Amino acid sequence: MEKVQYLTRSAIRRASTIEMPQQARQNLQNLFINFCLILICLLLICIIVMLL
Amino acid sequence: MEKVQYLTRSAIRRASTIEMPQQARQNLQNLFINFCLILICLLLICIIVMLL
Amino acid sequence: MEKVQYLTRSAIRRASTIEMPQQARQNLQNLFINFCLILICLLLICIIVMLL
Amino acid sequence: MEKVQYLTRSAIRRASTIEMPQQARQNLQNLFINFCLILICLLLICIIVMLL
Amino acid sequence: MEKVQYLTRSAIRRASTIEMPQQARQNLQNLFINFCLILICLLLICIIVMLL
């Protein structure tokens, strides 16, 4: 019953930490950006590899 | 009549939240950046797929 | 005479807002980054289109 | 024995500085992002070189 | 003699401003990120041009 509510809450937690009262938000923000950038780096590596 | 005004306001809201008094601006800022980065990642994926 | 001074000031304004006393700097900072990312996205789109 | 603990701590240090109490977090955050972007730039250079 | 020390200091200055006490760090941080992104944009342009 409330199983789904927990999951819903988990979703909220994921979206609440990134906006937590503490300025640590910038840290998470920094990680998400870094991760996305890393993914791009990997994609570029894969592109180089795939093409060559 | 004021229909357009509401839309205009909606535009303002979109541009006001990103600069809301709260430091949560960084959170939104983080999301826009993440989304843009994600789009790039997808584009790169599409490039890999299209080329290969 | 002072025409050029106004332009010089305009240049300063462009470089002063991004560093305005208010923490809104992050908002502008966010936009410049988003715009640059958007340009990259467009470039990638153009690359996909050009190649394919 | 505690050798591994030191390494574990070193890992924590790497993840603690990026979130240090000071707002200098943004500086580190800036560097990680810059480094990732730089890597992308290099990758792009390598792509240009590899393709051409 | 102290010539090198000045250069060393210059290096420190470059790494001290990005982490200056003022929150203007975000402004510099913004510029480094924008510049890196711009370089990527240019690289992409060069890629489009080189390939096509």
PDB file of C-alpha atoms in Angstrom:
ATOM      1  CA  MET A   1       0.000   0.000   0.000  1.00  0.00           C
ATOM      2  CA  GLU A   2       2.409   2.650   1.263  1.00  0.00           C
ATOM      3  CA  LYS A   3       5.151   0.908  -0.652  1.00  0.00           C
ATOM      4  CA  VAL A   4       4.680   3.253  -3.524  1.00  0.00           C
ATOM      5  CA  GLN A   5       4.630   6.162  -1.127  1.00  0.00           C
ATOM      6  CA  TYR A   6       8.122   5.255  -0.003  1.00  0.00           C
ATOM      7  CA  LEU A   7       9.297   5.233  -3.590  1.00  0.00           C
ATOM      8  CA  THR A   8       7.597   8.549  -4.142  1.00  0.00           C
ATOM      9  CA  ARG A   9       9.425   9.841  -1.113  1.00  0.00           C
ATOM     10  CA  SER A  10      12.666   8.420  -2.458  1.00  0.00           C
ATOM     11  CA  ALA A  11      12.100  10.473  -5.570  1.00  0.00           C
ATOM     12  CA  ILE A  12      11.533  13.511  -3.439  1.00  0.00           C
ATOM     13  CA  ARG A  13      14.716  12.790  -1.496  1.00  0.00           C
ATOM     14  CA  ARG A  14      16.669  12.696  -4.724  1.00  0.00           C
ATOM     15  CA  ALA A  15      15.191  16.064  -5.647  1.00  0.00           C
ATOM     16  CA  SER A  16      15.382  17.467  -2.100  1.00  0.00           C
ATOM     17  CA  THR A  17      19.069  16.892  -1.444  1.00  0.00           C
ATOM     18  CA  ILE A  18      20.078  18.808  -4.554  1.00  0.00           C
ATOM     19  CA  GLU A  19      18.187  21.689  -3.014  1.00  0.00           C
ATOM     20  CA  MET A  20      18.918  21.020   0.655  1.00  0.00           C
ATOM     21  CA  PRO A  21      18.950  24.142   2.927  1.00  0.00           C
ATOM     22  CA  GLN A  22      22.723  23.847   3.230  1.00  0.00           C
ATOM     23  CA  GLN A  23      24.875  25.423   0.537  1.00  0.00           C
ATOM     24  CA  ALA A  24      26.163  21.897  -0.064  1.00  0.00           C
ATOM     25  CA  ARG A  25      23.729  22.024  -2.975  1.00  0.00           C
ATOM     26  CA  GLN A  26      26.640  23.363  -4.990  1.00  0.00           C
ATOM     27  CA  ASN A  27      28.581  20.197  -4.193  1.00  0.00           C
ATOM     28  CA  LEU A  28      25.878  17.941  -5.593  1.00  0.00           C
ATOM     29  CA  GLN A  29      25.342  20.348  -8.395  1.00  0.00           C
ATOM     30  CA  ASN A  30      29.017  20.068  -9.030  1.00  0.00           C
ATOM     31  CA  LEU A  31      28.866  16.286  -9.130  1.00  0.00           C
ATOM     32  CA  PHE A  32      25.914  16.093 -11.511  1.00  0.00           C
ATOM     33  CA  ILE A  33      27.667  18.486 -13.828  1.00  0.00           C
ATOM     34  CA  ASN A  34      30.941  16.614 -13.516  1.00  0.00           C
ATOM     35  CA  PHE A  35      29.221  13.301 -14.183  1.00  0.00           C
ATOM     36  CA  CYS A  36      27.442  14.658 -17.220  1.00  0.00           C
ATOM     37  CA  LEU A  37      30.724  16.080 -18.455  1.00  0.00           C
ATOM     38  CA  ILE A  38      32.429  12.765 -17.792  1.00  0.00           C
ATOM     39  CA  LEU A  39      29.764  10.989 -19.804  1.00  0.00           C
ATOM     40  CA  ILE A  40      30.467  13.392 -22.640  1.00  0.00           C
ATOM     41  CA  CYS A  41      34.168  12.679 -22.311  1.00  0.00           C
ATOM     42  CA  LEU A  42      33.474   8.948 -22.524  1.00  0.00           C
ATOM     43  CA  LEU A  43      31.179   9.478 -25.476  1.00  0.00           C
ATOM     44  CA  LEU A  44      33.928  11.389 -27.223  1.00  0.00           C
ATOM     45  CA  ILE A  45      36.351   8.578 -26.420  1.00  0.00           C
ATOM     46  CA  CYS A  46      33.873   6.104 -27.842  1.00  0.00           C
ATOM     47  CA  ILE A  47      33.506   8.284 -30.916  1.00  0.00           C
ATOM     48  CA  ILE A  48      37.243   8.339 -31.460  1.00  0.00           C
ATOM     49  CA  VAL A  49      37.407   4.639 -30.960  1.00  0.00           C
ATOM     50  CA  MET A  50      34.407   3.882 -33.103  1.00  0.00           C
ATOM     51  CA  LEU A  51      35.545   6.116 -35.922  1.00  0.00           C
ATOM     52  CA  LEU A  52      39.118   5.031 -35.425  1.00  0.00           C
TER      53      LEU A  52
ATOM     54  CA  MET B   1      -7.637  40.590 -22.989  1.00  0.00           C
ATOM     55  CA  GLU B   2      -5.457  39.864 -19.962  1.00  0.00           C
ATOM     56  CA  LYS B   3      -4.902  36.392 -21.341  1.00  0.00           C
ATOM     57  CA  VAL B   4      -1.699  37.501 -22.905  1.00  0.00           C
ATOM     58  CA  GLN B   5      -0.712  39.198 -19.690  1.00  0.00           C
ATOM     59  CA  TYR B   6      -0.887  35.866 -17.908  1.00  0.00           C
ATOM     60  CA  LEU B   7       1.388  34.338 -20.501  1.00  0.00           C
ATOM     61  CA  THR B   8       3.725  37.275 -20.152  1.00  0.00           C
ATOM     62  CA  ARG B   9       3.701  36.684 -16.430  1.00  0.00           C
ATOM     63  CA  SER B  10       4.370  33.002 -17.020  1.00  0.00           C
ATOM     64  CA  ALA B  11       7.448  34.018 -18.945  1.00  0.00           C
ATOM     65  CA  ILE B  12       8.501  36.198 -16.077  1.00  0.00           C
ATOM     66  CA  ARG B  13       7.933  33.342 -13.647  1.00  0.00           C
ATOM     67  CA  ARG B  14      10.222  31.133 -15.679  1.00  0.00           C
ATOM     68  CA  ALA B  15      12.860  33.852 -15.552  1.00  0.00           C
ATOM     69  CA  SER B  16      12.127  34.821 -11.933  1.00  0.00           C
ATOM     70  CA  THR B  17      12.527  31.409 -10.334  1.00  0.00           C
ATOM     71  CA  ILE B  18      16.010  30.977 -11.761  1.00  0.00           C
ATOM     72  CA  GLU B  19      16.822  34.170  -9.921  1.00  0.00           C
ATOM     73  CA  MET B  20      14.580  33.720  -6.880  1.00  0.00           C
ATOM     74  CA  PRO B  21      15.816  35.440  -3.652  1.00  0.00           C
ATOM     75  CA  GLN B  22      16.649  32.036  -2.197  1.00  0.00           C
ATOM     76  CA  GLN B  23      20.021  30.503  -3.023  1.00  0.00           C
ATOM     77  CA  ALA B  24      18.005  27.671  -4.565  1.00  0.00           C
ATOM     78  CA  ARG B  25      18.869  29.462  -7.790  1.00  0.00           C
ATOM     79  CA  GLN B  26      21.934  27.249  -7.883  1.00  0.00           C
ATOM     80  CA  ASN B  27      19.669  24.201  -7.882  1.00  0.00           C
ATOM     81  CA  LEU B  28      17.775  25.352 -10.951  1.00  0.00           C
ATOM     82  CA  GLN B  29      20.974  26.544 -12.460  1.00  0.00           C
ATOM     83  CA  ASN B  30      22.288  23.092 -11.838  1.00  0.00           C
ATOM     84  CA  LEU B  31      19.336  21.479 -13.564  1.00  0.00           C
ATOM     85  CA  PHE B  32      19.497  23.668 -16.655  1.00  0.00           C
ATOM     86  CA  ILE B  33      23.169  22.909 -16.979  1.00  0.00           C
ATOM     87  CA  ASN B  34      22.611  19.206 -16.363  1.00  0.00           C
ATOM     88  CA  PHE B  35      19.803  19.115 -18.907  1.00  0.00           C
ATOM     89  CA  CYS B  36      21.913  20.872 -21.498  1.00  0.00           C
ATOM     90  CA  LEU B  37      24.764  18.483 -20.792  1.00  0.00           C
ATOM     91  CA  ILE B  38      22.369  15.563 -21.026  1.00  0.00           C
ATOM     92  CA  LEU B  39      21.192  16.801 -24.397  1.00  0.00           C
ATOM     93  CA  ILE B  40      24.817  16.895 -25.505  1.00  0.00           C
ATOM     94  CA  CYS B  41      25.298  13.360 -24.246  1.00  0.00           C
ATOM     95  CA  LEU B  42      22.251  12.246 -26.211  1.00  0.00           C
ATOM     96  CA  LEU B  43      23.497  14.080 -29.269  1.00  0.00           C
ATOM     97  CA  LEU B  44      26.819  12.312 -28.955  1.00  0.00           C
ATOM     98  CA  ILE B  45      24.979   9.005 -28.625  1.00  0.00           C
ATOM     99  CA  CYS B  46      23.006   9.861 -31.725  1.00  0.00           C
ATOM    100  CA  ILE B  47      26.223  10.753 -33.500  1.00  0.00           C
ATOM    101  CA  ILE B  48      27.784   7.420 -32.621  1.00  0.00           C
ATOM    102  CA  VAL B  49      24.676   5.648 -33.710  1.00  0.00           C
ATOM    103  CA  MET B  50      24.237   7.651 -36.867  1.00  0.00           C
ATOM    104  CA  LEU B  51      27.859   7.284 -37.881  1.00  0.00           C
ATOM    105  CA  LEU B  52      27.917   3.711 -36.667  1.00  0.00           C
TER     106      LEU B  52
ATOM    107  CA  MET C   1      33.839  62.779 -27.655  1.00  0.00           C
ATOM    108  CA  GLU C   2      32.368  60.945 -24.669  1.00  0.00           C
ATOM    109  CA  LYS C   3      30.573  58.678 -27.099  1.00  0.00           C
ATOM    110  CA  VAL C   4      33.314  56.163 -26.803  1.00  0.00           C
ATOM    111  CA  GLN C   5      33.243  56.516 -23.054  1.00  0.00           C
ATOM    112  CA  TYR C   6      29.636  55.382 -23.045  1.00  0.00           C
ATOM    113  CA  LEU C   7      30.571  52.326 -25.055  1.00  0.00           C
ATOM    114  CA  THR C   8      33.437  51.677 -22.695  1.00  0.00           C
ATOM    115  CA  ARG C   9      30.977  51.930 -19.850  1.00  0.00           C
ATOM    116  CA  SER C  10      28.634  49.574 -21.671  1.00  0.00           C
ATOM    117  CA  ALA C  11      31.457  47.074 -21.763  1.00  0.00           C
ATOM    118  CA  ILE C  12      31.968  47.548 -18.076  1.00  0.00           C
ATOM    119  CA  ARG C  13      28.256  47.066 -17.459  1.00  0.00           C
ATOM    120  CA  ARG C  14      28.360  43.761 -19.283  1.00  0.00           C
ATOM    121  CA  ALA C  15      31.273  42.710 -17.093  1.00  0.00           C
ATOM    122  CA  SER C  16      29.855  44.291 -13.926  1.00  0.00           C
ATOM    123  CA  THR C  17      26.468  42.590 -13.894  1.00  0.00           C
ATOM    124  CA  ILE C  18      28.021  39.145 -14.048  1.00  0.00           C
ATOM    125  CA  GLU C  19      29.795  40.149 -10.867  1.00  0.00           C
ATOM    126  CA  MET C  20      27.095  42.322  -9.313  1.00  0.00           C
ATOM    127  CA  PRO C  21      27.111  42.473  -5.451  1.00  0.00           C
ATOM    128  CA  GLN C  22      23.949  40.372  -5.392  1.00  0.00           C
ATOM    129  CA  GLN C  23      24.286  36.596  -5.547  1.00  0.00           C
ATOM    130  CA  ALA C  24      22.251  36.857  -8.743  1.00  0.00           C
ATOM    131  CA  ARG C  25      25.656  36.484 -10.372  1.00  0.00           C
ATOM    132  CA  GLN C  26      24.969  32.765 -10.309  1.00  0.00           C
ATOM    133  CA  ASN C  27      21.855  33.349 -12.402  1.00  0.00           C
ATOM    134  CA  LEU C  28      23.778  35.121 -15.139  1.00  0.00           C
ATOM    135  CA  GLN C  29      26.553  32.656 -14.766  1.00  0.00           C
ATOM    136  CA  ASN C  30      23.957  29.999 -15.245  1.00  0.00           C
ATOM    137  CA  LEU C  31      22.659  31.615 -18.412  1.00  0.00           C
ATOM    138  CA  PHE C  32      26.075  32.057 -20.008  1.00  0.00           C
ATOM    139  CA  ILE C  33      26.849  28.440 -19.302  1.00  0.00           C
ATOM    140  CA  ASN C  34      23.449  27.314 -20.558  1.00  0.00           C
ATOM    141  CA  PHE C  35      23.825  29.390 -23.708  1.00  0.00           C
ATOM    142  CA  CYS C  36      27.269  27.986 -24.377  1.00  0.00           C
ATOM    143  CA  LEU C  37      25.949  24.485 -23.802  1.00  0.00           C
ATOM    144  CA  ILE C  38      23.021  25.212 -26.077  1.00  0.00           C
ATOM    145  CA  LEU C  39      25.405  26.355 -28.777  1.00  0.00           C
ATOM    146  CA  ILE C  40      27.246  23.070 -28.382  1.00  0.00           C
ATOM    147  CA  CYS C  41      23.973  21.195 -28.676  1.00  0.00           C
ATOM    148  CA  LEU C  42      23.166  23.090 -31.857  1.00  0.00           C
ATOM    149  CA  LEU C  43      26.637  22.422 -33.184  1.00  0.00           C
ATOM    150  CA  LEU C  44      26.172  18.740 -32.506  1.00  0.00           C
ATOM    151  CA  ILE C  45      22.821  18.877 -34.279  1.00  0.00           C
ATOM    152  CA  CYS C  46      24.498  20.580 -37.204  1.00  0.00           C
ATOM    153  CA  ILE C  47      27.191  17.925 -37.173  1.00  0.00           C
ATOM    154  CA  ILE C  48      24.626  15.142 -37.309  1.00  0.00           C
ATOM    155  CA  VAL C  49      22.818  16.911 -40.062  1.00  0.00           C
ATOM    156  CA  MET C  50      25.926  17.779 -41.990  1.00  0.00           C
ATOM    157  CA  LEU C  51      27.360  14.296 -41.723  1.00  0.00           C
ATOM    158  CA  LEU C  52      23.943  12.769 -42.208  1.00  0.00           C
TER     159      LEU C  52
ATOM    160  CA  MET D   1      46.215  -2.869   9.615  1.00  0.00           C
ATOM    161  CA  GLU D   2      45.107   0.763   9.742  1.00  0.00           C
ATOM    162  CA  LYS D   3      46.859   1.286   6.437  1.00  0.00           C
ATOM    163  CA  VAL D   4      43.635   0.766   4.625  1.00  0.00           C
ATOM    164  CA  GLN D   5      41.904   3.089   7.030  1.00  0.00           C
ATOM    165  CA  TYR D   6      44.233   5.878   5.981  1.00  0.00           C
ATOM    166  CA  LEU D   7      43.376   5.251   2.358  1.00  0.00           C
ATOM    167  CA  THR D   8      39.715   5.213   3.256  1.00  0.00           C
ATOM    168  CA  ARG D   9      40.241   8.516   4.983  1.00  0.00           C
ATOM    169  CA  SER D  10      42.062   9.823   1.932  1.00  0.00           C
ATOM    170  CA  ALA D  11      38.984   8.995  -0.083  1.00  0.00           C
ATOM    171  CA  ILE D  12      36.879  10.851   2.408  1.00  0.00           C
ATOM    172  CA  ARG D  13      39.229  13.827   2.233  1.00  0.00           C
ATOM    173  CA  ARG D  14      38.811  13.954  -1.519  1.00  0.00           C
ATOM    174  CA  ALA D  15      35.056  13.940  -1.045  1.00  0.00           C
ATOM    175  CA  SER D  16      35.123  16.236   2.002  1.00  0.00           C
ATOM    176  CA  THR D  17      37.051  19.130   0.498  1.00  0.00           C
ATOM    177  CA  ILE D  18      34.609  19.467  -2.374  1.00  0.00           C
ATOM    178  CA  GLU D  19      32.005  19.971   0.312  1.00  0.00           C
ATOM    179  CA  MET D  20      34.116  21.799   2.886  1.00  0.00           C
ATOM    180  CA  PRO D  21      32.181  24.222   5.194  1.00  0.00           C
ATOM    181  CA  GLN D  22      33.768  27.159   3.389  1.00  0.00           C
ATOM    182  CA  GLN D  23      32.141  28.416   0.197  1.00  0.00           C
ATOM    183  CA  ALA D  24      35.443  27.544  -1.466  1.00  0.00           C
ATOM    184  CA  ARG D  25      33.522  24.468  -2.575  1.00  0.00           C
ATOM    185  CA  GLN D  26      32.589  26.496  -5.627  1.00  0.00           C
ATOM    186  CA  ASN D  27      36.277  26.894  -6.437  1.00  0.00           C
ATOM    187  CA  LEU D  28      36.884  23.156  -6.459  1.00  0.00           C
ATOM    188  CA  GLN D  29      33.616  22.650  -8.181  1.00  0.00           C
ATOM    189  CA  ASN D  30      34.837  25.104 -10.728  1.00  0.00           C
ATOM    190  CA  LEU D  31      38.073  23.220 -11.233  1.00  0.00           C
ATOM    191  CA  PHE D  32      36.445  19.820 -11.656  1.00  0.00           C
ATOM    192  CA  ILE D  33      34.097  21.279 -14.212  1.00  0.00           C
ATOM    193  CA  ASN D  34      36.918  23.113 -15.972  1.00  0.00           C
ATOM    194  CA  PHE D  35      39.041  19.979 -16.026  1.00  0.00           C
ATOM    195  CA  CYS D  36      36.208  17.921 -17.441  1.00  0.00           C
ATOM    196  CA  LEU D  37      35.571  20.594 -20.047  1.00  0.00           C
ATOM    197  CA  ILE D  38      39.271  20.692 -20.834  1.00  0.00           C
ATOM    198  CA  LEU D  39      39.263  16.946 -21.333  1.00  0.00           C
ATOM    199  CA  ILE D  40      36.380  17.392 -23.756  1.00  0.00           C
ATOM    200  CA  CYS D  41      38.323  20.082 -25.580  1.00  0.00           C
ATOM    201  CA  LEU D  42      41.307  17.758 -25.845  1.00  0.00           C
ATOM    202  CA  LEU D  43      39.067  14.954 -27.021  1.00  0.00           C
ATOM    203  CA  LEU D  44      37.659  17.221 -29.693  1.00  0.00           C
ATOM    204  CA  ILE D  45      41.195  18.168 -30.701  1.00  0.00           C
ATOM    205  CA  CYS D  46      42.063  14.495 -30.891  1.00  0.00           C
ATOM    206  CA  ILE D  47      38.956  13.897 -32.965  1.00  0.00           C
ATOM    207  CA  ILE D  48      39.927  16.604 -35.428  1.00  0.00           C
ATOM    208  CA  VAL D  49      43.410  15.251 -35.592  1.00  0.00           C
ATOM    209  CA  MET D  50      42.351  11.656 -35.855  1.00  0.00           C
ATOM    210  CA  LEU D  51      39.773  12.357 -38.528  1.00  0.00           C
ATOM    211  CA  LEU D  52      42.055  14.867 -40.175  1.00  0.00           C
TER     212      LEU D  52
ATOM    213  CA  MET E   1      67.126  35.935  -7.502  1.00  0.00           C
ATOM    214  CA  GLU E   2      63.622  36.786  -6.308  1.00  0.00           C
ATOM    215  CA  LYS E   3      62.565  36.990  -9.930  1.00  0.00           C
ATOM    216  CA  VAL E   4      61.340  33.470  -9.789  1.00  0.00           C
ATOM    217  CA  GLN E   5      59.586  34.203  -6.538  1.00  0.00           C
ATOM    218  CA  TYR E   6      57.523  36.854  -8.282  1.00  0.00           C
ATOM    219  CA  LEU E   7      56.521  34.353 -10.925  1.00  0.00           C
ATOM    220  CA  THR E   8      55.681  31.862  -8.226  1.00  0.00           C
ATOM    221  CA  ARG E   9      53.558  34.525  -6.616  1.00  0.00           C
ATOM    222  CA  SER E  10      51.932  35.254  -9.958  1.00  0.00           C
ATOM    223  CA  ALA E  11      50.950  31.617 -10.105  1.00  0.00           C
ATOM    224  CA  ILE E  12      49.512  31.882  -6.646  1.00  0.00           C
ATOM    225  CA  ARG E  13      47.601  35.007  -7.642  1.00  0.00           C
ATOM    226  CA  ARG E  14      46.032  33.150 -10.532  1.00  0.00           C
ATOM    227  CA  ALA E  15      44.988  30.410  -8.127  1.00  0.00           C
ATOM    228  CA  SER E  16      44.067  32.814  -5.312  1.00  0.00           C
ATOM    229  CA  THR E  17      41.627  35.010  -7.203  1.00  0.00           C
ATOM    230  CA  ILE E  18      39.525  32.037  -8.248  1.00  0.00           C
ATOM    231  CA  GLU E  19      39.182  31.380  -4.543  1.00  0.00           C
ATOM    232  CA  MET E  20      39.170  34.964  -3.274  1.00  0.00           C
ATOM    233  CA  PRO E  21      37.225  35.547   0.010  1.00  0.00           C
ATOM    234  CA  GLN E  22      34.530  37.366  -1.943  1.00  0.00           C
ATOM    235  CA  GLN E  23      31.774  35.317  -3.558  1.00  0.00           C
ATOM    236  CA  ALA E  24      33.029  36.781  -6.830  1.00  0.00           C
ATOM    237  CA  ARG E  25      34.711  33.402  -7.147  1.00  0.00           C
ATOM    238  CA  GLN E  26      31.552  32.304  -8.922  1.00  0.00           C
ATOM    239  CA  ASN E  27      32.118  35.023 -11.513  1.00  0.00           C
ATOM    240  CA  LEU E  28      35.592  33.772 -12.363  1.00  0.00           C
ATOM    241  CA  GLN E  29      34.363  30.251 -12.124  1.00  0.00           C
ATOM    242  CA  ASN E  30      31.708  31.250 -14.560  1.00  0.00           C
ATOM    243  CA  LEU E  31      34.238  32.694 -16.973  1.00  0.00           C
ATOM    244  CA  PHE E  32      36.545  29.683 -16.912  1.00  0.00           C
ATOM    245  CA  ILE E  33      33.600  27.435 -17.590  1.00  0.00           C
ATOM    246  CA  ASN E  34      32.288  29.731 -20.316  1.00  0.00           C
ATOM    247  CA  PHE E  35      35.716  29.927 -21.928  1.00  0.00           C
ATOM    248  CA  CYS E  36      36.096  26.166 -21.871  1.00  0.00           C
ATOM    249  CA  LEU E  37      32.626  25.796 -23.340  1.00  0.00           C
ATOM    250  CA  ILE E  38      33.461  28.392 -25.967  1.00  0.00           C
ATOM    251  CA  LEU E  39      36.574  26.455 -26.887  1.00  0.00           C
ATOM    252  CA  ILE E  40      34.400  23.382 -27.306  1.00  0.00           C
ATOM    253  CA  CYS E  41      32.028  25.354 -29.496  1.00  0.00           C
ATOM    254  CA  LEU E  42      34.950  26.499 -31.632  1.00  0.00           C
ATOM    255  CA  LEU E  43      36.262  22.962 -31.802  1.00  0.00           C
ATOM    256  CA  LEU E  44      32.875  21.769 -32.963  1.00  0.00           C
ATOM    257  CA  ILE E  45      32.839  24.532 -35.564  1.00  0.00           C
ATOM    258  CA  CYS E  46      36.281  23.439 -36.687  1.00  0.00           C
ATOM    259  CA  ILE E  47      35.067  19.865 -36.844  1.00  0.00           C
ATOM    260  CA  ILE E  48      32.135  20.816 -39.039  1.00  0.00           C
ATOM    261  CA  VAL E  49      34.397  22.845 -41.220  1.00  0.00           C
ATOM    262  CA  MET E  50      37.117  20.254 -41.366  1.00  0.00           C
ATOM    263  CA  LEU E  51      34.722  17.433 -42.118  1.00  0.00           C
ATOM    264  CA  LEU E  52      32.680  19.658 -44.375  1.00  0.00           C
TER     265      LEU E  52
END
